[PDB]
Amino acid sequence: SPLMGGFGLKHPPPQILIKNTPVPANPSTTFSAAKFASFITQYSTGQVSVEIEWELQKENSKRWNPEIQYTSNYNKSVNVDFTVDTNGVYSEPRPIGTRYLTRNL
Amino acid sequence: SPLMGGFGLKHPPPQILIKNTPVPANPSTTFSAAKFASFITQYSTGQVSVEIEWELQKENSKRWNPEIQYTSNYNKSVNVDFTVDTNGVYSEPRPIGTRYLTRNL
């Protein structure tokens, strides 16, 4: 298991490597065997999509009393948590773990 | 709708009426046209089972931030809520409603 948490994979999802192809600028009309150092300055943009399918493991508990669950504070506040501000900046207020339900040993 | 809350039914679940059959005590060996007033004092006990099937209506919300949910207090206490005491007496600490999720108008 990875010590920062997560899924240890011998074959992880692969690296996806991307690069702008070099478009050279105006070459000299005489030949030079040196490599090109002058390129057209360019960048690229676009959209990227990732679609992961997850397999769930459902609770099968016979516990009587209710369990501790992650809830939002339903009191008045200036900013709603996990939303944007007045300046349009998204923020995350706290780290949300994943151990809220209970199982016996 | 019933004003104490619930399901208005023109044909509700029917009344289930139960009664111990009168077993008379020792009658006189001469006939008397009066009704019996002396019975063997008896009671009955047993088990009763009710099995209601409910139809659920699942949430289909596109809400981003988390919703208010009924949780148990996960702090230290003398008695766990909705359990028995040291004397074995079950209690309910508070009324639990049913409106915790949200839908738009």
From Swiss-Prot, chains A, B:
Location within or outside the cell: Virion; Host nucleus, Host nucleolus
Practical application: AAV capsids serve as viral gene transfer vectors that have been shown to affect long-term gene expression and disease correction with low toxicity in animal models, and are well tolerated in human clinical trials.
Miscellaneous comment as given in the Swiss-Prot or TrEMBL entry: The ratio at which VP1, VP2 and VP3 proteins are synthesized in vivo is about 1:1:10, which is the same as in the mature virus particle.
Function summary: Capsid protein self-assembles to form an icosahedral capsid with a T=1 symmetry, about 22 nm in diameter, and consisting of 60 copies of three size variants of the capsid protein VP1, VP2 and VP3 which differ in their N-terminus. The capsid encapsulates the genomic ssDNA. Binds to host cell heparan sulfate and uses host ITGA5-ITGB1 as coreceptor on the cell surface to provide virion attachment to target cell. This attachment induces virion internalization predominantly through clathrin-dependent endocytosis.
Record-stated family: Belongs to the parvoviridae capsid protein family.
Domains (record comment): The N-terminus of VP1 is sequestered within the mature capsid. It contains a phospholipase A2-like region and putative nuclear localization signals.
Name of the protein this chain belongs to: Capsid protein VP1
Species assigned in the record: Adeno-associated virus 2 (isolate Srivastava/1982) (AAV-2)
